[PDB]
């Protein structure tokens, strides 16, 4: 018949399914990091502006994945999208752990994907996900990881604003 | 003190928080519809571009309400972003009275927080809403109501794809 | 000694081989499809152009091959390109039901070459394949997937005339 | 009635399904030539890239003729393309032999197409082969008999490198 | 914690620290080439820019490996790089012959390391290697046995001065 | 008879040798130390950027050497390059001190070097000494002296950090 779909495995839509999901939330953690380096009583626009283009990147990772559920003619399906765990992120030290902790599941997530659709022998899937995000995820962590180290250096206070304005305030 | 709050009440700061939730409703709303007229068996471009659209649109709503509950000096909670009601929206016409739809209940929800900004005095607030907010919502009502006469008009099959090229395709 | 061979099997060389006898009937098939929609009593030219396209395109796709199979020290060994299963092709709807299938057929036997280059622990090969090949095919079939939901939309007489000009025409 | 056949005999149809069918087959020599002066082994990138250039050209050629077939309002009919006679073609003077062999078999069935033609009184017909295909002919055989007399003065080894810089290199 | 480390093996980190080793040897061999052809009694100007060229090549091969442990979370750990084979060369024959036999050290060395990614199910590595150096080994070793296959068939003498001009001179 | 060696002693054929490998080496330190500020738990840029390029230019040091070397007749003779003396390099201040001594070392054999040629009366030699080396040296000490200053000045933590910017970032 006319449907394009070949070798592609319900189980591999079903976890390019849950993958969106979690690019959508992720994007979600970002948008309330940045609203809370907005805040007047925190104001750090360096740190706003960088999450949200973190949160605009993500929401562009869910909408590549969107677009590969149909590419391969599965059905995307959505689910709600969850609150991040916490309203208030602290300093900007805290907001780095916890987006640090959040691209390392994100990338374990995308790791799994990626177990999912060898172990099914889906060879495209597979490069479209190595093309597209892992080498992605790969750098996004290392970067947040020397903010981290910097921000310990830099210390609290006036290094905390100094730090701010490089990541491009 | 050193805060930036003045005229701003708590009914009004909850309102903003419960219109950026509907705002990113209607962004997600409209990603599914255009990831239903994506699919290898519906296959219309011109809506599918015409949701996307509309989904970023919808995002940035929300994200100048976020702006604005900062400049106010309000706290931004998020909620939960509940999935849409369906996952296969139907025909190109089931899909834009089902936008229709949506926009005239954010529509309601945006009357009803001017409504509230002004029975609390906020004249500012009353302000950025019908400049932001207000005739946009109008124009978008108006422009899916037309859609929707014309797909009445082209009819079925043919008209409907000649009909989806015309939103843009 | 002097040649370049390493790490390459004589199975994923015949392999090869092949994969080029498969791209040039591919290209074959659709330079038929292109002289059947330019008949007089056909006279369909976007399907024409179209299928012109996708002829010289298959075409690059087995030179490609052809020079891999150099580049890794292979051996090219030609074999007679077999005339297509038909010789009059249909309406445009028939036409693209049949390059659909010929796609998903081309596909097979890439995830099938790729099957064969991983099991032989190929993976300059198999990486080859993927950034050539594989998500070339996903896209040329989910495409062209899209046109027979639309040529169906459309229907016959003026559809198929209407959805001839926006292939291309 | 509505077709555009006039004046086009059955026998001149068949023929130019015929130099159809020879095209391609010239087209699928060069091919082979090229592949084969692409090898590690063997070397020679001006003699690949001016055999690519002639497969590519005979390619021209055949469509053409194809497309010359449904403008006299004739049925294009395909048959195998027969693999070439060799896989491996020796030196750069036993390849411009070949090479010349062909061109010379291509043109005799030029001729014999035309004598055709002019036979059924077919000006037209007559015209587009001295048009498109004769001098054409003529120009290549007497191109490769130069490169031939000339290899044969620059001698093996070097002189063979040295001329193959020259067919363009 | 902090680090960026994930699904990173120690094995992977310790091929990673050996690759560097020897690319940076693959370098130094190379720089002996060029100095080689260099000398007022070899003066061959094109095998020695082309040396040069394949030595700072291969530098950078080295310097993105440690990147990408870095990248990664790993240690970059530097051994001695062991000095070359030979201090002379002999002719251009003969280094080609040397430099083949070195790629393919090279290449065997990064397809170990490739089958290390993968027995550690590390697809972000394995892609890495692809990417930037699989390809790019296949078309070294392809090159360079076409010129020993044309510096045979030039020959010594007056052979070897103009093919040492294509190289690039 | 042929050769170009005149006036050049055996003894500063070898000492040219010796720095040679001296050059290579102070390239490998300063390889090292870019390597160890480009670690996730360090992540200086400036130090990373500034060691890379002081890497680069000693391997451009070793080639000029190399040249010359060629130049006067001599003839190259390679030496392992000896891993450097750490793996990790300490804070900023520490590995400017280690790179203080460095070209302080390598100043000296410079100089001794020069002193070797003004023996042997090579005043060409002392002269390429001069004009490509001596200077350079005095500037690049200067340099990182003022650097060691600074640093001193800046102490350690924030000013680290802000130091590392003005290196160039
Ligand atoms: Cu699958
Ligand atoms: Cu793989
Ligand atoms: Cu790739
Ligand atoms: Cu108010
Ligand atoms: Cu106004
Ligand atoms: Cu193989
Ligand atoms: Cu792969
Ligand atoms: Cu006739
Ligand atoms: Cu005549
Ligand atoms: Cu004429
Ligand atoms: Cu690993
Ligand atoms: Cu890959
Ligand atoms: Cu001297
Ligand atoms: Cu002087
Ligand atoms: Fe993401
Ligand atoms: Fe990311
Ligand atoms: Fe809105
Ligand atoms: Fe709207
Ligand atoms: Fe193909
Ligand atoms: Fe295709
Ligand atoms: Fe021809
Ligand atoms: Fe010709
Ligand atoms: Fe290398
Ligand atoms: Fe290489
Ligand atoms: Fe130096
Ligand atoms: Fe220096």
Known sequence: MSLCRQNYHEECEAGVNKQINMEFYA???????????????????????????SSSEEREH????????????????????????????????????????????????????????????????????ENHYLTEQVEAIREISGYLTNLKRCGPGLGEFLFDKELNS
Not at 31 to 40: K, Q, T, V
Not at 71 to 87: F, L, M, S, T
Not at 111 to 129: E, R, T, V
Request: hydrophobic letters at 40%; proline letters at 2%; one cysteine or more.
């Open 27 to 53: 994007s979600y953690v970002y948008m309330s990091m940045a609203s809370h380096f907005d805040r007047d009583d925190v104001a750090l626009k360096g740190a706003h502006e960088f999450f949200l283009k």
């Open 62 to 129: 869910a909408m590549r994945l969107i677009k590969f559920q149909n590419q391969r003619g599965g059905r995307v399906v959505y689910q709600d999208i969850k609150k991040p765990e916490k309203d208030a992120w602290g300093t900007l030290t805290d907001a780095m752990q916890a987006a640090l902790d959040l691209e390392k599941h994100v990338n374990q997530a995308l790791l799994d994907l990626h177990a999912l659709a060898s172990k099914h022998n889906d060879p495209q899937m597979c490069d479209f996900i």
